[PDB]
Design a protein around this ligand. Structure first.
Ligand SMILES: *[C@@H]1O[C@H](CO[C@@H]2O[C@@H](C)[C@@H](O)[C@@H](O)[C@@H]2O)[C@@H](O[C@@H]2O[C@H](CO)[C@@H](O[C@@H]3O[C@H](CO[C@H]4O[C@H](CO)[C@@H](O)[C@H](O)[C@@H]4O)[C@@H](O)[C@H](O[C@H]4O[C@H](CO)[C@@H](O)[C@H](O)[C@@H]4O[C@@H]4O[C@H](CO)[C@@H](O[C@@H]5O[C@H](CO[C@]6(C(=O)O)C[C@H](O)[C@@H](NC(C)=O)[C@H]([C@H](O)[C@H](O)CO)O6)[C@H](O)[C@H](O)[C@H]5O)[C@H](O)[C@H]4NC(C)=O)[C@@H]3O)[C@H](O)[C@H]2NC(C)=O)[C@H](O)[C@H]1NC(C)=O
Lengths: 232, 208
């Protein structure tokens, strides 16, 4: 059937041009209108614009000055170009076939109709971050053992994986030899533009005496591997 | 943003009251999934969409568009957007709604909160991070306020949105970033997680 796939630089420095590509398979772009929609982390679904071979093409007024939707029949692709990108342009960008209908509520004669558009087929969306952030490896801090929050006989210890960029970070413990009781929290995107995550593992309190706990933080984006011994 | 049990009927209002005549589309945005058209032309269900999903009819004027989901199931937990097209109102480029329908497919679970103080290492590096780790709560909505001694702390707070852990319960993080000064000076700092009316509050102190 029709499948859509948005692709493009997942990360874009502010003022640079966000350009995305919707690759349509099992349908001609020429058979449909095409919309781009973004979900900005702020407020939900922003219909960016739509484009047809017709030339029936319109852009969100908030983006009209900056955006260029565009069809490439040979490449069978819808393309979005958003110049002068800012953090507000961060979000998941969806390509969608746009269908349309007439809503005829009076009589055509009195012009009592309108064309409405709707998107039946959406691509998965490609996340786009507009960030001044440059690749930064993580400071990894030990979260020394704490019994307060865990069940009896056990304690939580962790590694705070602080101020890295971009995603992702991988944390294992004792080189994967400790999987039981491990909870790696998803990262937080901070004001810094930087991510921090924590990974706690809950272990026998008895073992703090003897068992060595090393979290193995891996942040391939910066080719950093940290192995934090977490002591009590 | 509303919660219903499976089987209950979800009614979702979205957008202003109708001015002229409308074709309202509804879209369902399941977490991580692509959105899907679930209603077009006010009431018309696209092929595939179950009869459980009804839309609101065009007239009378002054009507609020309303998605009705009956016999709600877990698959219905999503964001729901109407896209209103009204004859006398300019074309909406931002989908109305974003109304998050939560399907309470399990009972309320109390948040487990772990709070870690700044590591020495961190303080050595002239930084200080309080880590609040919140886990195993349901539904996945918490509120996290930090307190220095007993005063609320505005800045330094970065809190993740919740995320499903494997056991279908939710987890979250809140970090409080401090200067070592800020940390060493207040007698305590508290991570207060409010979930579903109840509050867990962990506290740590520079004296450790
Ligand atoms: C748009 O987005 C869509 C939808 O996105 C999804 O939905 C969103 C909301 C979110 O959840 C996203 O994560 C989703 O992706 C997306 O389409 C999706 O694409 C996904 C992956 O890209 C698919 O994921 C799969 O999902 C299934 C479950 O699907 C059910 O639920 C789905 C989602 O919930 C739903 O979509 C479906 O309707 C369905 O109801 C899941 O099971 C899959 O998991 C496998 O695959 C991943 C990697 O793909 C892997 O990480 C997992 O561990 C798992 O791998 C399989 O693991 C099992 C168990 O371990 C293995 O079984 C064992 O196999 C061995 C074989 O041994 C080997 C060997 O090492 O020797 C393997 C060798 O390589 C092989 N050698 C050779 C030469 O072949 C051999 C060989 O196989 C035999 O030895 C020959 O005899 O052996 C033995 O058989 C053992 O006995 C056996 O136990 C498997 O082998 C292993 N296989 C694989 C393939 O790795 C997976 O996660 C989504 O389903 C899919 N959804 C849809 C609708 O398409 C889409 O991409 C996006 N659109 C685009 C294009 O942009």
């Amino acid at each position: 059937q029709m499948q859509l796939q948005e692709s493009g630089p997942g990360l874009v420095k502010p003022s640079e041009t966000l350009s995305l590509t919707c690759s349509v398979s099992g349908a001609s772009i020429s058979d449909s209108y095409w919309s781009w929609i973004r979900r900005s982390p702020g407020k939900g679904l922003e219909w960016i614009g739509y484009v047809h071979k017709s030339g029936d093409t319109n852009y969100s007024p908030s983006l009209k000055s900056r955006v260029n939707l565009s069809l490439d029949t040979s490449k069978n692709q819808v393309s979005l170009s958003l110049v002068a990108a800012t953090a507000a342009d961060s979000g998941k960008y969806y390509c969608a076939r746009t269908l349309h209908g007439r809503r005829i509520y009076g009589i055509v004669a009195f012009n009592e109709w309108f064309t409405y558009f709707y998107m039946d087929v959406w691509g998965n969306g490609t996340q786009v971050t507009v960030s001044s952030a440059s690749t930064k490896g993580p400071s990894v801090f030990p979260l020394a053992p704490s019994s307060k929050s865990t069940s009896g006989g056990t304690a939580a210890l962790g590694c705070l994986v602080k101020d890295y960029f971009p995603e992702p970070v991988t944390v294992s413990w004792n080189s994967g030899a400790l999987t039981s009781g491990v909870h790696t929290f998803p990262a937080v995107l901070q004001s810094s533009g930087l991510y921090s995550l924590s990974s706690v593992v809950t272990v026998p309190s008895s073992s703090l005496g003897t068992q060595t706990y090393i979290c193995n933080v891996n942040h391939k984006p910066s080719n950093t591997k940290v192995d934090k011994r977490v002591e009590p | 943003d509303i919660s219903v049990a499976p089987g209950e009927t979800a009614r979702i209002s979205c957008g202003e009251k109708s001015l002229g005549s409308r074709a309202v589309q509804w879209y369902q945005h399941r977490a991580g999934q692509a959105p899907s058209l679930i209603i077009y032309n006010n009431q018309d269900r696209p092929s595939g969409i179950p009869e459980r999903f009804s839309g609101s009819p065009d007239s009378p004027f002054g009507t609020t568009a309303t998605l009705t989901i009956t016999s709600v199931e877990a698959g219905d937990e999503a964001d729901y957007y109407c896209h209103i097209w009204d004859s006398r109102v300019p074309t909406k480029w931002v989908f109305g709604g974003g109304t998050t329908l939560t399907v309470l497919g399990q009972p309320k679970a109390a948040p487990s909160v772990t709070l870690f103080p700044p590591s020495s290492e961190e303080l050595q590096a002239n930084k200080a991070t309080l880590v609040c780790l919140i886990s195993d709560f349901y539904p996945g909505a918490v509120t996290v306020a930090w307190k220095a001694d007993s005063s609320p702390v505005k800045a330094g707070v970065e809190t993740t949105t919740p995320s499903k852990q494997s056991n279908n319960k939710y987890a979250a993080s809140s970090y409080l970033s401090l200067t070592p000064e800020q940390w060493k000076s207040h007698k305590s700092y508290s991570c207060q997680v409010t979930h579903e009316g109840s509050t867990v509050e962990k506290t740590v102190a520079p004296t450790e």
